[PDB]
């Protein structure tokens, strides 16, 4: 049936005994199955003396050869010819178990043969290119004779005339076309260096000076017939070199194109056998007996599937020797396994970056998928910015298949990882903007206002409003653009944030309840849950319920003044019964009663758990940490309010100083003014707001889940579960 | 190569390992006996050249190349004559003829690098033109050897 | 059981190793017996040759 994951599933430690002959095939099929984590067996044996070292270094050499081939591919005009298909074939290996085969030796031999042949071909091509460059200079035709860059010919002439104070003939001519310089590796201009002078020593000095200026010289025949014969011989040699160069280039290009058609497949495969041999050395192999034997961690609810797959492999192979496996129930802590769909993978990863949920308790990864986006939206509520961010997410979701086969890069790396979080994030932003009725800090008018202005408002005079109705969803749009609006919004958020944060605390602490109840934990529940729950309720839940009742009762209509919220909170701690105006009858009795209850929670939280105490030192620090931490988180819940105001008035000022100036005088120049100002406003609204403060509120709503939620029930770190599997990583680069 | 790969493979049985070692030693002795310049000369005397000598004698065994240098590149002239006869026969499309031509081209390329003087003999006998024509042959396996030989002749001797 | 199965596998591996060692010892004993039989055959050939010479 189903094997979904709240926090984990019961997983088993299984030991493997396998025959030597089918050991590699079993490792390959297990790797393409990828479900078991092998614990440490021969970690004492260091790397330089492992069992499979020689094939490890052989595979390293062939990997280097493949990297050399890919270097040639990128140097030429081809890249990943099979990347479209080979990547899919490796990805299609899931639930397919492709055969591996003993063609690894053939792969190694063919790779070495291709490597040496390509090395020889590359050496031939570079040498023949050097010859071609040399002959082009030698092809020049009109004592000493040579060619040199046309930039330095004047300097050469001047220095020659200076160092040789005597006279000499100079008949330099610029080359018709630039020639690729060997040293400069650039197609710079060139010029002839024909010169004639008497004196053997003078000629030798001139030759040395010319060679000192990176000038190449040739034995140009003075006689017309000899020069013509030399030119004809050079032309014939150049034609032969052109022919052989074309043949070599065609052969090299064909070889590289053939290699690129399957290089990705061999690279992915050889990486898979690299992992296979790494796991092989990780085993407890011993050549004195049945060679391979090892142990591993498997989920219990797929041991039957694993055994069936192994039996299918054994049927595929010719060996009839059984290789069954059995569970070994040790006392060690099992790893932590979390199945997750694409809609939850990023959520769970971000949630457990704090720590690893050790076992079959209740984790925090599941509630995150909903609490995270809604906390961010509470801190971010706006139809405009939320709509932009949701369109970004949606455009990152529909083209998922396009993005799965490409690298996002340092602009969208975290975005690619958080590809689905921001979608539900933007949906909750839709909600919060529906409630926080501002759109780019401007309020919508879809619903009729419940508050009516006076029929005759004086221009410039203060104007009051009478509550002649109520607004169905969100704040009444009459609040927009009023002095008292901000205060009303501060009070409302205060209370909204405090209620949401308290309810999040209660939800996490009930997760702690479920965690404790899953195990026996009879001492743990009585020692920690009930006293802490009673304290937390009696203070903060009482605050919440009296807030709700304060909202429920029509204080203006009832005649009774609305008591100060924080005073009704704290005069409990100062002097019970000191009530300016009770919320409900018998209020002071409730105050003293549950205040005494909260006070006696502390000895309850301190005494009952350490009973047999040796763990009293841990218990007392846990108790004080819990109480101060509860009050700290309850206070921290006010920065949802803080971010809400930051976003609201930041959008307000941005709109007021961009769009409220865009219209200007509404002239012909006003059109350009509003175009430029809306361009600036959009650039800011995106880059500043939805990136900077969008990420800020995202990360702060994430701070919620780091500390306030998980510190209540995340007991500690557990062993991560990473089964031996291939992933087709590093298609081209690593 | 199969025995080399088997020796590389980690056979579990000690008896199998000893047998593999003995077979490898026998194969190495046979290869060393195949590295005889006299054997290469005898093979070149007849047709259907084998591929085991020409990887050492026209190569690491520079003594064979030095001997082939004698009598004014007598062995090189004989090989060039054999190649010219094979080309002129018109049966290059034959698989056996293709293998013989490939072996001859490999030997000629090995000899040319060692003895640059043989380039003049090849040019006088038309070996250069024959090699250039063979560079366009459809036999890709023979084409690679022909291109290597042309690069060796043009790259070193023609320079 | 799992531990019992591991012990049985170890015992089977030890038995296989002992069988291989016994086969090697049998091969060595066969070589020694071949040497002894060669000595006996040499003695028999010497006796037969002496008998043939005496008969001649």
UniProtKB/Swiss-Prot annotation, chain A:
UniProt key word Metal-binding: no
The keyword Glycoprotein belongs to this UniProt entry's keyword annotation: yes
Residue ranges crossing the lipid bilayer per the database entry: 362-380, 383-399, 414-443, 492-511, 530-550, 594-612, 624-648, 670-708
Consequence the record notes for mutating residue 550 to A: Reduces ATPase activity
Changes after translation: Glycosylated.
Matching Pfam families: V_ATPase_I
Membrane topology field: Multi-pass membrane protein
Domain of life of the source: Eukaryota
Subcellular location: Vacuole membrane
Main location: membrane
Segments on the Vacuolar face: 381-382, 444-491, 551-593, 649-669
InterPro entries associated with the record: V-ATPase_116kDa_su, V-type_ATPase_116kDa_su_euka
Ranges in a coiled coil: 114-142
One Gene Ontology term, aspect cellular component: membrane raft
Mutagenesis or variant effect for residue 706 to R: Reduces assembly of V-ATPase complexes
BP terms from Gene Ontology: cellular hyperosmotic response; cellular response to alkaline pH; polyphosphate metabolic process; protein localization to vacuolar membrane; protein-containing complex assembly; proton transmembrane transport; vacuolar acidification
Record annotation: effect of changing residue 718 to D: Reduces assembly of V-ATPase complexes
UniProt entry keywords in alphabetical sequence: Acetylation, Coiled coil, Glycoprotein, Hydrogen ion transport, Ion transport, Membrane, Transmembrane, Transmembrane helix, Transport, Vacuole
Topology feature Cytoplasmic, residues: 1-361, 400-413, 512-529, 709-734
GO molecular function: ATPase binding; phosphatidylinositol-3,5-bisphosphate binding; proton-transporting ATPase activity, rotational mechanism
Subunit architecture: V-ATPase is a heteromultimeric enzyme composed of a peripheral catalytic V1 complex (components A to H) attached to an integral membrane V0 proton pore complex (components: a, c, c', c'', d, e, f and VOA1).
Family: Belongs to the V-ATPase 116 kDa subunit family.
Record's miscellaneous remark: Present with 55714 molecules/cell in log phase SD medium.
Protein's UniProt name: V-type proton ATPase subunit a, vacuolar isoform
Species of the source: Saccharomyces cerevisiae (strain ATCC 204508 / S288c) (Baker's yeast)
Curated annotation (Swiss-Prot), chain B:
Disulphide connectivity of cysteines: none
Deletion consequences: Increases the ATPase activity of membrane-detached V-ATPase V1. Abolishes growth at pH 7.5 and in the presence of calcium chloride, abrogates growth at pH 5.0.
Localisation: Vacuole membrane
Domain of life (superkingdom): Eukaryota
Functional description taken from the UniProt entry: Subunit of the V1 complex of vacuolar(H+)-ATPase (V-ATPase), a multisubunit enzyme composed of a peripheral complex (V1) that hydrolyzes ATP and a membrane integral complex (V0) that translocates protons. V-ATPase is responsible for acidifying and maintaining the pH of intracellular compartments. This subunit is essential for activity, but not assembly, of the enzyme complex. This subunit is also required for silencing the ATPase activity of V-ATPase when V1 is detached from V0.
Family: Belongs to the V-ATPase H subunit family.
Note in the entry: Present with 22500 molecules/cell in log phase SD medium.
Oligomer status and interactors: V-ATPase is a heteromultimeric enzyme composed of a peripheral catalytic V1 complex (components A to H) attached to an integral membrane V0 proton pore complex (components: a, c, c', c'', d, e, f and VOA1). Interacts with YND1.
Protein known as: V-type proton ATPase subunit H
Originating organism: Saccharomyces cerevisiae (strain ATCC 204508 / S288c) (Baker's yeast)
From Swiss-Prot, chain C:
Entry-annotated residues carrying N-acetylserine: 1
Subcellular localization: Vacuole membrane
UniProt superkingdom: Eukaryota
Functional description taken from the UniProt entry: Subunit of the V1 complex of vacuolar(H+)-ATPase (V-ATPase), a multisubunit enzyme composed of a peripheral complex (V1) that hydrolyzes ATP and a membrane integral complex (V0) that translocates protons. V-ATPase is responsible for acidifying and maintaining the pH of intracellular compartments.
Further comment: Present with 2280 molecules/cell in log phase SD medium.
Protein family per UniProt: Belongs to the V-ATPase G subunit family.
Assembly: V-ATPase is a heteromultimeric enzyme composed of a peripheral catalytic V1 complex (components A to H) attached to an integral membrane V0 proton pore complex (components: a, c, c', c'', d, e, f and VOA1).
Designated name of the protein: V-type proton ATPase subunit G
Organism encoding this protein: Saccharomyces cerevisiae (strain ATCC 204508 / S288c)
Upper classification of the organism: Eukaryota, Fungi, Dikarya, Ascomycota, Saccharomycotina
Name of the gene: VMA10
Residues of the full protein shown: 2 to 57 of 114
């Amino acid at each position: 049936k189903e094997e979904a994951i709240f926090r984990s599933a019961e997983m088993a430690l299984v030991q493997f005994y396998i025959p030597q002959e089918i050991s590699r095939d079993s490792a390959y099929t297990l790797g393409q199955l990828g479900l078991v984590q092998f614990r440490d067996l021969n970690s004492k044996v260091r790397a330089f003396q492992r069992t499979f070292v020689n094939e490890i270094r052989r595979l390293d050499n062939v990997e280097r050869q493949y990297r050399y081939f890919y270097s040639l591919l990128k140097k030429h005009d081809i890249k990943l010819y099979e990347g479209d298909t080979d990547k899919y074939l490796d990805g299609s290996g899931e639930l397919y178990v492709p055969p591996s085969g003993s063609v690894i030796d053939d792969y190694v031999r063919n790779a070495s043969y291709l490597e040496e042949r390509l090395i020889q071909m590359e050496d031939a091509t570079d040498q023949i290119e050097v010859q071609k460059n040399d002959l082009e200079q030698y092809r020049f035709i009109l004592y000493v004779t040579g060619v040199i860059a046309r930039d330095k010919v004047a300097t050469l002439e001047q220095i020659l005339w200076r160092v040789l104070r005597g006279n000499l003939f100079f008949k330099t001519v610029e080359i018709e076309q630039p020639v690729y310089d060997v040293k400069t590796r650039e197609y710079k201009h060139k010029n002839a260096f024909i010169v004639f002078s008497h004196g053997d020593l003078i000629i030798k000095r001139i030759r040395k000076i010319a060679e000192s200026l990176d000038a190449n010289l040739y034995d140009v025949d003075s006689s017309n017939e000899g020069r013509s014969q030399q030119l004809a011989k050079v032309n014939k040699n150049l034609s032969d070199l052109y022919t052989v160069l074309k043949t070599t280039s065609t052969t090299l290009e064909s070889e590289l194109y053939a290699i690129a058609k399957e290089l990705d497949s061999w690279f992915q495969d050889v990486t898979r056998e690299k992992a296979i041999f790494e796991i092989l050395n990780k085993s407890n192999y011993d050549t004195n007996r049945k060679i391979l034997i090892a142990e591993g961690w498997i989920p219990r609810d797929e041991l039957a599937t694993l055994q069936a797959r192994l039996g299918e492999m054994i049927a595929r192979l010719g060996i009839d020797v059984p290789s069954i496996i059995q569970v070994l129930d040790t006392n060690h802590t099992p790893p932590t396994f979390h199945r997750t769909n694409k809609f939850t993978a990023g959520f769970q990863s971000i949630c457990d970056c704090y720590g690893i949920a050790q076992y079959r308790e209740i984790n925090a990864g599941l509630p995150t998928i909903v609490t995270f986006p809604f906390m961010f939206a509470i801190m971010f509520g706006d139809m405009g910015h939320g709509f932009l961010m949701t369109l970004a997410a949606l455009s990152l979701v529909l083209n998922e298949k396009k993005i799965n086969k490409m690298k996002r890069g340092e602009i969208f790396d975290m975005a690619f990882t958080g590809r689905y979080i921001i979608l539900l994030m933007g949906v909750f932003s839709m909600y919060t903007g529906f409630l926080y009725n501002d759109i780019f800090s401007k309020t919508m008018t879809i619903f009729k206002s419940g508050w009516k202005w006076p029929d005759h408002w004086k221009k410039g005079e203060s104007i009051t409003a009478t509550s002649v109705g109520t607004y169905p969803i969100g704040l009444d749009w009459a609040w927009h653009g009023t002095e008292n609006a901000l205060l009303f919004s501060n009070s409302y958020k205060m209370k909204l944030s405090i209620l949401m944060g308290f309810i999040h605390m209660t939800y996490s602490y009930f997760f702690s309840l479920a965690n404790h109840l899953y195990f026996n934990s009879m001492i743990d529940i009585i020692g920690n849950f009930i006293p802490g729950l009673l304290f937390m309720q009696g203070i903060f839940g009482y605050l919440s319920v009296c807030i709700v009742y304060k909202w429920a009762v029509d204080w203006v209509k009832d005649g009774k003044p609305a008591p100060g919220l924080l005073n009704m909170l704290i005069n409990m701690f100062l002097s019970p019964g000191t009530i300016d105006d009770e919320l409900y009858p018998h209020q002071a009795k409730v105050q003293v009663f549950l205040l005494l209850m909260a006070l006696v929670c502390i000895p309850w939280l301190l005494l009952v758990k350490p009973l047999h105490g040796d763990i009293m030192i841990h218990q007392v620090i846990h108790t004080i940490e819990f109480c101060l931490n509860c009050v700290s988180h309850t206070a921290s819940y006010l920065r949802l309010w803080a971010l809400s105001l930051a976003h609201a008035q930041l959008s307000s000022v941005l709109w007021t100083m961009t769009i409220q100036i865009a219209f200007g005088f509404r002239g012909f120049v006003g059109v350009f003014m509003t175009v430029a100002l809306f361009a600036m406003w959009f650039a800011l609204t995106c880059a500043v707001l939805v990136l900077m403060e969008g990420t800020s509120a995202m990360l702060h709503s994430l701070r919620l889940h780091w500390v306030e939620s998980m510190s209540k029930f995340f007991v500690g770190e557990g062993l991560p579960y990473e089964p031996f599997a291939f992933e087709y990583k590093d298609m081209e680069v690593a | 190569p199969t025995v080399q790969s088997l020796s590389e493979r980690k056979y579990s049985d000690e008896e199998l390992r000893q047998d593999i070692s003995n077979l490898k030693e026998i194969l190495e002795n046979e290869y060393q006996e195949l590295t005889s310049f006299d054997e290469y000369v005898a093979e070149l005397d007849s047709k259907l050249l084998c591929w085991s000598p020409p990887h050492v004698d026209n190569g690491f065994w520079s003594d064979n190349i030095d001997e082939f240098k004698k009598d004014n590149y007598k062995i090189f002239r004989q090989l060039i004559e054999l190649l010219q006869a094979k080309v002129r026969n018109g049966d290059v499309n034959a698989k056996q003829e293709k293998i013989i031509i490939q072996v001859a081209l490999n030997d000629i390329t090995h000899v040319v690098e060692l003895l640059p003087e043989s380039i003049d003999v090849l040019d006088k006998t038309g070996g250069k033109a024959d090699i250039m024509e063979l560079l366009n042959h459809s036999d890709s396996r023979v084409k690679y050897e022909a291109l290597k030989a042309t690069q060796a002749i043009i790259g070193y001797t023609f320079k | 059981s799992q531990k019992n199965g591991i012990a049985t596998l170890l015992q089977a591996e030890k038995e296989a190793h002992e069988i291989v060692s016994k086969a090697r010892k049998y091969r060595q004993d066969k070589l020694k017996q071949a040497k002894t039989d060669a000595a006996k055959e040499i003695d028999s050939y010497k006796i037969q040759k002496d008998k043939e010479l005496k008969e001649f």
